[PDB]
Amino acid sequence: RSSLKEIEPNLFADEDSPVHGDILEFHGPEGTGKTEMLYHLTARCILPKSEGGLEVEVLFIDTDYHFDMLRLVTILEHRLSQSSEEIIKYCLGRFFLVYCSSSTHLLLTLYSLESMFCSHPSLCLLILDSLSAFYWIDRVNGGESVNLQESTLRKCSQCLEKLVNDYRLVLFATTQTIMQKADIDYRPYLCKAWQQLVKHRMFFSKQDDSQSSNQFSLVSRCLKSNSLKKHFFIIGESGVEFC
DNA sequence: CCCCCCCCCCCCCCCCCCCCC
Ligand SMILES: Nc1ncnc2c1ncn2[C@@H]1O[C@H](COP(=O)(O)OP(=O)(O)OP(=O)(O)O)[C@@H](O)[C@H]1O
Ligand SMILES: [Mg+2]
């Protein structure tokens, strides 16, 4: 019922099999277009089929409290050929947002979301933002024992893998670059189960030069085939546009 | 792996005549 190529032919030019459970990951520093990419994916997924959409529902989980409905509405109205309030209402009728305040809160939200997931059959995409939102607090609360710094993340990863395997969903996660290492910059620090659960990896970067910005770099790295690709794209009032 | 800063030195080098009872 779900096809990965249709979601994004630009980035997913190799994956053509009907997706029946995948885990992806975004990574990079601040202000490099991760949330804009998520907005573009949601816009591609929730638009009507007449305007070039997918007509399936999206679930969103916000952890860093950085979601902006105004930007999403602006992108939707710019992508639409004709702007009308009722069509925007129809589009937004298939969008859901959840807030979590702590690791246990997120764990219980995951333990509760399966009721909706069995209730709603049209869900095809799942987004978790800022998976590394609670790292320092958990680490400090865990003392010097590593196993006490990893339990909540372990349980959340197990629940996420169970959900994605059971309900045939697509997961999009975001992490933050917090620590360096004594061309890809990546110093893994997450849970071992989460690290081994990843399938695709994408890194984000921004041009240092001030050519009015308008240039972002993305490096796609799939662990299945060890294929490294570089993408260039721009972000405008209508969303993101690939160079 | 984790976060932010310091401070001056030292002297050189001469030119140029005027005016008769
Ligand atoms: N209307 C717009 N036109 C052009 N660029 C825009 C517009 N709106 C936002 N941007 C760009 O969006 C960029 C930030 O993107 P975004 O909010 O997705 O960051 P991010 O990589 O997800 O970072 P973080 O998660 O730390 O917030 C800015 O650098 C800005 O130039
Ligand atoms: Mg962001």
Determine the Cα angle at A211 with ends A209 and A215, to 5°: 85
Q: Which helix (H) or strand (E) holds A231?
A: strand A227-236
Q: Locate the domains of chain A by residue range.
A: 4-242
CA A237 to each of CA A25, A74, A230: distance values in angstroms, whole numbers, following the listed order: 25, 8, 24
A136 CA: nearest nucleotide by C1': B2
Determine the Cα angle at A219 with ends A217 and A224, to 5°: 165
> Would you list the DSSP string of A190-203?
S-HHHHHH--EEEE
> Would you list the DSSP string of A4-66?
HHHH-TTT-SS--SPPSSEEEEEE-SSSSSHHHHHHHHHHHHHS-TTTT----EEEEEESSS-
d(CA A151, CA A148): 6
d(CA A192, CA A76): 38
Nearest to A79 by CA among A240, A238, A243: A238
d(CA A211, CA A78): 25
- Ligand 1 pocket test, pick from A27, A35, A216 with the greatest ligand atom count within 8 Å of Cβ, gives A35
d(CA A221, CA A202): 6
d(CA A54, CA A211): 35
Q: How was this structure determined?
A: cryo-EM
What is the distance, to the nearest Å, from the Cα of residue A104 to the centroid of all Cα atoms in its chain?
Answer: 21
User: Resolution of the deposited coordinates, in angstroms?
Assistant: 2.7
Q: Which helix (H) or strand (E) holds A230?
A: strand A227-236
> Which phi-psi region, left, alpha or beta, contains residue A65 (left: φ > 0; alpha: ψ -120 to 50)?
left
Q: Are strands A216-222 and A227-236 parallel, antiparallel or unpaired?
A: antiparallel
Quick check: helix, strand or coil at residue A156? helix
Q: Which fold does the domain A4-242 belong to in CATH?
A: Rossmann fold (3.40.50)
What are the pocket residues of ligand 1 if the criterion is a CB atom closer than 6 Å to any ligand atom? A 30-36, 66, 213, 235-237
